[PDB]
Design a protein around this nucleic acid. Structure first.
Ligand SMILES: [Mg+2]
Ligand SMILES: [Mg+2]
Ligand SMILES: [Mg+2]
Ligand SMILES: [Mg+2]
Lengths: 210, 60, 97, 126, 156, 92
RNA sequence: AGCUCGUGUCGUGAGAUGUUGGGUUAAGUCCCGCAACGAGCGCAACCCUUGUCUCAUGUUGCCAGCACGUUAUGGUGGGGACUCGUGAGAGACUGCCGGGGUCAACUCGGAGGAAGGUGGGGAUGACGUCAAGUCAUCAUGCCCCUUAUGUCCAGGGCUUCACACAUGCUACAAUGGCCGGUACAAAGGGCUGCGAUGCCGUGAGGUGGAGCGAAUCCUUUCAAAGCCGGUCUCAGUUCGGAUCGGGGUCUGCAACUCGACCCCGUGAAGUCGGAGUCGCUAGUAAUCGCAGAUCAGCAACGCUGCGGUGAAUACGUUCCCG
């Protein structure tokens, strides 16, 4: 809706980190190719399982993936049926092995991406988007080491035709302040009528992080 | 745009007249700009991720 | 003049490279130089994303490329080898002037 | 020995004030070979013209960066600082002319989408 | 500055070979986008020619010409009550000197002679003698001010 | 200090505050100072000071007089308006 | 610089207060008040570059004091007291005084100071209008094509043209043109790319290699405007360079339709431009060139950064537009 710049995309080298931290001469192309291929492969699985961030690093001809799952148990089921299955799928789709190592998050309500995934799933489950956003804000403000939140679900809300963008906020969510350490989440929900956008902001605290 | 065609068109081709782009990421022979040797999709993906050598979009 | 007109892709990367160079040369025990103040520039990147009618929201989004320099004099082959043995970051595309 | 520093937009200079005969030995070039514009001569003499010590003190400067006018201003600032450190009583005689301080006026950072700094593109009405 | 207050006058040092703030201002005005030394040499040659022609002090002759061509009244245009009036207002010394120097340099560039040095020398000589384009423009401005004097009662 | 622009239009809360302040001032005669929490005593003291500073008219008349002497009608625009809406008599 | 919100207060109700009156700035920044109390999106600061100094260290920069050297260069040892490109700290916080101002915010002057009253300049783009730009970055509900509108190939086109509009370069001449001799700037393009000395060339350049994942190498131990000497004698010309013909070059297999560059001749418009209109407040305009984004080969005079030399005005908001 607005022209506000992505805080993560702006502070990718000041406050926030990078999801792809590697370097290669003439091979960065193939590196990012394999990265986006793995991302597209894990999209459906880790979305049905709950995903926050997929940090991929490149080593001497091998890979180092770190996926931040929210609900462990769906993707990690029986040892040799789901995890090893997806590992073998990634390996046979790429030209190398995969030493997959999952890392569990500390609080799903504290991560912006997870809150966006949850609110989008709620909206797609044929529920009141207003109540869904309210409960998500309550969960994310129930003292998860946070100080502010701002949730927005744009697009064709309620399966209507008008692009209603409900602006819901709570606490302190400054965008012009650099010393914010604000987490951002951008999600695209698919419905039977079209697409919907979910923009979330979680101002955890005023930590410098220098 | 498969591995065989990519390997056949990247090295010395049979006839010199075959000097098309033959991108390395997607492999499509056309619809790719030789300015960067990449198809628009991955080109802009890397541009937004901050990986391609110097491509960006609106700020003014 | 000499040493140097180079360029890097990341401020963190280039400052870490300068720091590790200073550390390795000081561990070899040779010497240091006198830094001087000089700013950086803004690279040339105003590329479009689509050949369509995107001529609103068009110009650019600056790619911050901060660069630092460290001058040196009185060559010594030992320092030459200690500096040319390896480069930890390898992402700073140094160019000789 | 006493030594000071002078700075400019993109230039630096280091001098060592000592007594003797007035001269300016630059880095490999002499006074007339380094200041051919005939205005930079007067500019760098102004610090030594307000107080008549042109042919009384020496100037052995070493500079780097900038152009003719920048080097002239840097050498003037260096001579001003040297006179401040040597003869405090003559400090007002140099401050009255607009010396002893580096002019904050310098080259700014050019803006984007424009031709030059503080210059919008020309466009005709429609 | 604009709508804030006046500007601080540059404490420029007097010219070393002439020592005249008016001469330095004329040099800064005739300066052609960075041609500092060139303009200095041009004005020096013009003053030397004027000296060789007259036989007196170049600075004194230039000051006399400036005082003789100084416009004592410059017309303006102000809308008061939905009606334009060209009311003449008292000009200041600095503004009058600047306008005089502007007219002088303009008429010197307009003069058709061999070189710019000779053009400026002849312009200065004509301004000092009282028969020149600068003096003609000064007289025209004075006549316009005397004709428009009918409307001067505001002093706003 | 501060003129309340509600004394003559919203006298409900004004009279409530007046009665509360009168009750507090009357209880102060008893001597129940140290028998209360420190934070509450401080809040009291502060409110009583603010009142005593901003209240000098409602403690004497209590009879809605029919005359007012106003000053500086430029800044006291609400006061002159209330006076005109509650009666023509006003000396400005 | 405004946009707002929870409660309260008045009105049957749309709605009124908060945002209404003053001091002052860039601010709805503050305070006096003010039936309102607090907060959010805002502003400033937080962030980046420059300006002064200090510490941890004195690198293929500098050489002051010592020496070793011959010119195309601190080229080679020894030297922190010299500009602190890596980290931090100090320094601007109206810090203090006076005229003030409501002795509340805030204004001017002065002392130290590099900057004195958000230091000079940017990143930082709120709720929303233009049913704003994008279904050819990508996804995208719906319709449509499928022996096709999917895909390749050889040629042509997007570069065409009797015209009009927009943005830039060349200039229109003596602050000039040509020839010879001369000084400092920051910024790097480099691995199938840069490429110095030489051979011969009017010149692109045919020979080519010391040297480079980063100061031994071009972009020179760095240019143009800038300074000295000779000439042109103020004119459609030694100004201007386009069309055109002849002699060639850089790339790649392929340059009239299909780049650029060099040598010779050819020598047109242009004599600073009407009606209208654009940009500029100090390192700004002006003027000069350097470098780069992609290319094996360029339409690149364009777009971005850089600095060389560097001006005049600032009664004032009556007035054109917001
Ligand atoms: Mg009601
Ligand atoms: Mg209102
Ligand atoms: Mg439309
Ligand atoms: Mg003529």
């Amino acid at each position: 809706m607005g022209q506000k710049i992505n805080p993560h995309g702006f502070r990718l080298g000041i406050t926030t980190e990078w999801k792809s931290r590697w370097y290669a001469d003439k091979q960065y192309k193939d590196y990012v190719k394999e990265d986006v291929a793995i991302r597209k492969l894990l999209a459906t699985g880790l979305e049905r399982a709950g995903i926050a961030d997929v940090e991929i690093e490149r080593t001497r001809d091998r890979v180092r993936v770190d996926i931040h799952t929210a609900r462990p148990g769906i993707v990690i089921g029986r040892r040799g049926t789901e995890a090893d299955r997806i590992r073998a799928d990634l390996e046979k789709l790429t030209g190398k092995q995969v030493q997959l190592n999952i890392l569990e998050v500390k609080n799903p309500e504290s991560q912006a991406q997870l809150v966006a995934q949850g609110v989008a799933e709620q909206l797609s489950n044929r529920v009141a988007f207003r109540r869904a956003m309210r409960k998500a804000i309550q969960s994310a403000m129930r003292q998860p080491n946070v100080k502010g939140i701002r949730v927005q679900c744009s697009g064709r809300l309620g399966g209507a035709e008008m692009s209603r963008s409900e602006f819901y906020r709570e606490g302190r969510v400054p965008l012009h302040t650099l010393r914010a350490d604000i987490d951002y989440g951008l999600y695209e929900a698919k419905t039977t009528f079209g697409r919907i956008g979910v923009k979330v902001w979680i101002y955890k605290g005023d930590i410098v992080g220098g | 745009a498969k591995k065989a065609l990519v390997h056949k068109a990247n090295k010395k081709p049979k006839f010199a007249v075959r000097a098309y782009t033959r991108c390395n990421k997607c492999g499509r022979p056309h619809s790719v700009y030789r300015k960067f040797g990449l198809c628009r999709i991955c080109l802009r993906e890397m541009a937004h991720a901050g990986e391609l050598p110097g491509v960006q979009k609106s700020s003014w | 003049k000499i040493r140097i007109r180079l360029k890097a892709y990341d401020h963190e990367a280039i400052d870490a490279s300068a720091r590790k160079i200073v550390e390795t040369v000081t561990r070899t025990g040779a010497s240091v130089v006198g830094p001087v103040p000089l700013p950086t520039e803004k690279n040339v990147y105003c590329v479009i994303r689509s050949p369509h009618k995107y001529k609103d929201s068009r110009e650019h989004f600056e790619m911050r490329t901060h660069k630092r320099l460290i001058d040196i004099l009185d060559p010594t082959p030992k320092t030459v080898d200690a500096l040319m043995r390896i480069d930890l970051p390898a992402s700073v595309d140094v160019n000789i002037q | 020995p006493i030594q000071t520093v002078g700075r400019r937009k993109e230039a630096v200079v280091r001098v060592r004030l000592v007594p003797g005969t007035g001269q300016f030995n630059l880095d490999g070039r002499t006074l007339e070979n380094y200041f051919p514009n005939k205005v930079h001569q007067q500019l760098i003499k102004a610090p030594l013209v307000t107080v008549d010590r042109v042919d009384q003190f020496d100037i052995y400067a070493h500079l780097d960066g900038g152009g003719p006018s920048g080097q002239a201003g840097a050498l003037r600032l260096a001579i001003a600082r040297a006179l401040i450190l040597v003869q405090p009583e003559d400090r007002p005689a140099l401050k009255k002319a607009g010396f002893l301080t580096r002019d904050p006026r310098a080259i700014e950072r050019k803006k984007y989408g424009l031709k030059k700094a503080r210059k919008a593109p020309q466009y005709s009405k429609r | 500055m604009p709508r804030k207050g006046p500007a601080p006058k540059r404490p420029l040092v007097n010219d070393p070979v002439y020592g005249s703030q008016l001469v330095t201002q004329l040099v800064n005005k005739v300066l052609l986008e960075g041609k500092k030394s060139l303009a200095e040499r041009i004005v020096y040659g013009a003053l030397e020619q004027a000296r060789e022609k007259t036989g007196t002090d170049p600075v004194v002759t230039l000051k006399r010409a400036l005082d003789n061509v100084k416009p004592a009244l410059e017309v303006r245009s102000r809308r008061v009550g939905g009606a334009t009036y060209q009311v003449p207002v008292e000009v200041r010394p600095d503004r009058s000197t600047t306008l005089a120097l502007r007219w002088l340099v303009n008429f010197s560039r307009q003069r058709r002679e061999k070189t710019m040095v000779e053009r400026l020398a002849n312009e200065i000589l004509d301004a000092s003698n009282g028969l020149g384009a600068s003096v003609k423009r000064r007289e025209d401005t004075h006549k316009m001010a005397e004709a428009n004097r009918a409307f001067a009662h505001y002093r706003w | 200090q501060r003129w309340l622009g509600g004394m003559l239009t919203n006298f409900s809360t004004v009279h409530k505050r007046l009665q509360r302040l009168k009750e507090l001032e009357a209880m102060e005669q008893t001597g129940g100072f140290e028998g209360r929490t420190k934070k509450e005593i401080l809040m009291l003291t502060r409110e009583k000071n603010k009142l005593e500073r901003s209240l000098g008219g409602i403690r004497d008349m209590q009879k809605v007089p029919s005359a007012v002497w106003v000053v500086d009608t430029n800044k006291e625009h609400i006061a002159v308006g209330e006076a005109r809406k509650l009666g023509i008599p006003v000396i400005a």
